[PDB]
Amino acid sequence: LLLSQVSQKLSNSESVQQQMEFLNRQLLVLGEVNELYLEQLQNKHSDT
Amino acid sequence: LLLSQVSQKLSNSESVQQQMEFLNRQLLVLGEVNELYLEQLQNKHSDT
Amino acid sequence: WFIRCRLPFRKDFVPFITKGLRSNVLLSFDDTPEKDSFRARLKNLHLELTETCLDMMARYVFSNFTAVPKRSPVGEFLLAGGRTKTWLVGNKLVTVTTSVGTGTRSLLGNLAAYVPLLTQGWAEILVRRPTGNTSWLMSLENPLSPFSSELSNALMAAERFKEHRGINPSFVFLQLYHSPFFGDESNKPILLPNESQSFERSVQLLDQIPSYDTHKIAVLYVGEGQSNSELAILSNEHGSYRYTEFLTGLGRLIELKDCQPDKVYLGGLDVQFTYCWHDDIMQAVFHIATLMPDKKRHLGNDFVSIVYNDSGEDFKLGTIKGQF
Amino acid sequence: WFIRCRLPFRKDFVPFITKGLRSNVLLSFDDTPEKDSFRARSLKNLHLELTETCLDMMARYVFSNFTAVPKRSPVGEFLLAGGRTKTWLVGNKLVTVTTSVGTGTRSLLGKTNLAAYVPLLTQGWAEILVRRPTGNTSWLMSLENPLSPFSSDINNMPLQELSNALMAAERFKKVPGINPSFVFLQLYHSPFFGDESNKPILLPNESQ
């Protein structure tokens, strides 16, 4: 069981740290999109 | 006991991989909506 | 001025503002005055105004955002129909809501056994003070009672985001307000009856009224011989070139359609440019121009009008039949 | 027992309980023995402390149960690590507010054109933790009212390069933030505070 567990757990820890950094950046990408939306309205505020 | 802990976290880790994979998708949809908003900003902001 | 001033040294103003305020009042008083608390950080109308001034100072010192909220779409979906309550406390109006249990990922599709526990964490708090309303999406971290009542920690709090893609709501309220040994009626938290549709209706009507000031102004273009016409005035179109120019640079406008919500004044959704000045404290719409064509009443009801002369001694107030 | 007591029909005894409590303080002293049961809103000094602790525990465990230990998810730490903080004592409760300055983001980047207003991006997140006798519990928060579209300089917030920086971060694999004082002021500013004891107190952050 120990052999199986370490052979799985190395990749476990690595991909989990990945999983972590990926989700944090995804959460950050939301602030950008929100600012985009607000600036879109600001611009879109004026009529063509 | 220690190995039980390790294998349990393994199952939790591998089981949460579908959830980790989900995040990937949302990344693409955020990217494309970012592009859409940026180009909306283009054709309504970069005007004459 | 307290709005547009630069962020630093905004606070220290509040001392002097409050000083002038409260020294001004009490020249004819019945009530013992109440100061601020920023040392840690008919006269009825007078007190109303002073309260409003303090409210604005508070809500606007130390930072400045939109005066209204706008919860994220996935947010709204998450607490959709969650169990909610509301408590008047002082002059504020606190309100909270709590999730129901349904999982976004549960719909998205192991760990599906505790998705009610995952979901049930997040709640929402919302305060409606005189100077506008703000809110927050609350997220719990203190877990359940395991002994009495291997779980995805990060991805749990993940799904609470901005625009990505039941627990008794009294809980958090009594959390943030439970100094027990006082608050008899001076600062007594007060629940309103969920049954009391009258009280709920009154709270709604309160939401219906805007936080910023209201102004609407009628802009007219008379001609040269159109003086004292009273129809060629209104029925006019395509005013002089100079009048049209002055009109272009008159703030900003928003076309009336699906794009513009009732957020700004939508008076007369029928037909176009209807330029509308706009900032945060006040908002002035120019409800009618020559370009606009109840309508006759629409422009006969604007209390004040700017009018483009374009004649020689065109106008006297007696000319216009606009009573308001 | 009140813990082991069912979550439903838990509030029921609460007044009776404090009644049973106030009826044990009948004649020991009656300075401020008032009811104060939250059914409305929903030496003998040792006896006062007793009543305090018991009703506080009830309030903590009425309407649900929850362990008295908070442990923030990694996301919270990443966001508000080293954040600008402030703690007050509204009454016997200990309230603490913390505010993020986007430390981990600027870490993601490791350029004033970006780093100048990088924290401005995530300047919304915050965290409020309250420690009562019954333990401490907290919540992470995200204000959801955008900046003043014109009076709070949100237009001059270049973001295309920020998106480019975000892509770079993905490849990697005066005051710099808002003042947490704001949130607290918001959540308790009944301007005519009608109970002097309730007047919140800011402990001086610097004199340790």
Curated annotation (Swiss-Prot), chains A, B:
Q: Which residues are listed as membrane-spanning?
A: none
From what superkingdom does this record's organism come? Answer: Eukaryota
UniProt note on tissues of expression:
Highly expressed in skeletal muscle, followed by heart, brain, placenta, pancreas, lung, liver and kidney. Also expressed in embryonic kidney cells.
Give the location in the cell.
Lysosome membrane; Cytoplasm, Cytosol
Oligomer status and interactors:
Component of the TSC-TBC complex (also named Rhebulator complex), composed of 2 molecules of TSC1, 2 molecules of TSC2 and 1 molecule of TBC1D7. Probably forms a complex composed of chaperones HSP90 and HSP70, co-chaperones STIP1/HOP, CDC37, PPP5C, PTGES3/p23, TSC1 and client protein TSC2. Forms a complex composed of chaperones HSP90 and HSP70, co-chaperones CDC37, PPP5C, TSC1 and client protein TSC2, CDK4, AKT, RAF1 and NR3C1; this complex does not contain co-chaperones STIP1/HOP and PTGES3/p23.
- Please give the function described in this protein's UniProt entry: Non-catalytic component of the TSC-TBC complex, a multiprotein complex that acts as a negative regulator of the canonical mTORC1 complex, an evolutionarily conserved central nutrient sensor that stimulates anabolic reactions and macromolecule biosynthesis to promote cellular biomass generation and growth. The TSC-TBC complex acts as a GTPase-activating protein (GAP) for the small GTPase RHEB, a direct activator of the protein kinase activity of mTORC1.
Q: What is known of its domains?
A: The C-terminal putative coiled-coil domain is necessary for interaction with TSC2.
Clinical disorder: Tuberous sclerosis 1: An autosomal dominant multi-system disorder that affects especially the brain, kidneys, heart, and skin. It is characterized by hamartomas (benign overgrowths predominantly of a cell or tissue type that occurs normally in the organ) and hamartias (developmental abnormalities of tissue combination). Clinical manifestations include epilepsy, learning difficulties, behavioral problems, and skin lesions. Seizures can be intractable and premature death can occur from a variety of disease-associated causes. Lymphangioleiomyomatosis: Progressive and often fatal lung disease characterized by a diffuse proliferation of abnormal smooth muscle cells in the lungs. It affects almost exclusively young women and can occur as an isolated disorder or in association with tuberous sclerosis complex.
Protein name, UniProt field: Hamartin
Organism from which the protein derives? Homo sapiens (Human)
Q: Which gene encodes it?
A: TSC1
Curated annotation (Swiss-Prot), chain C:
Indicate where this protein resides in the cell: Lysosome membrane; Cytoplasm, Cytosol
Q: How is expression of this protein distributed across tissues?
A: Liver, brain, heart, lymphocytes, fibroblasts, biliary epithelium, pancreas, skeletal muscle, kidney, lung and placenta.
What does changing L266A do? Decreased GTPase-activating protein activity
Q: Which residues carry this modification: Phosphothreonine?
A: T32
Outline what the protein does.
Catalytic component of the TSC-TBC complex, a multiprotein complex that acts as a negative regulator of the canonical mTORC1 complex, an evolutionarily conserved central nutrient sensor that stimulates anabolic reactions and macromolecule biosynthesis to promote cellular biomass generation and growth. Within the TSC-TBC complex, TSC2 acts as a GTPase-activating protein (GAP) for the small GTPase RHEB, a direct activator of the protein kinase activity of mTORC1.
Subunit organization:
Component of the TSC-TBC complex (also named Rhebulator complex), composed of 2 molecules of TSC1, 2 molecules of TSC2 and 1 molecule of TBC1D7. Probably forms a complex composed of chaperones HSP90 and HSP70, co-chaperones STIP1/HOP, CDC37, PPP5C, PTGES3/p23, TSC1 and client protein TSC2. Probably forms a complex composed of chaperones HSP90 and HSP70, co-chaperones CDC37, PPP5C, TSC1 and client protein TSC2, CDK4, AKT, RAF1 and NR3C1; this complex does not contain co-chaperones STIP1/HOP and PTGES3/p23. (Microbial infection) Interacts with human cytomegalovirus protein UL38; this interaction inhibits cellular stress response mediated by mTORC1.
Q: What is this protein called?
A: Tuberin
- Gene name on record? TSC2
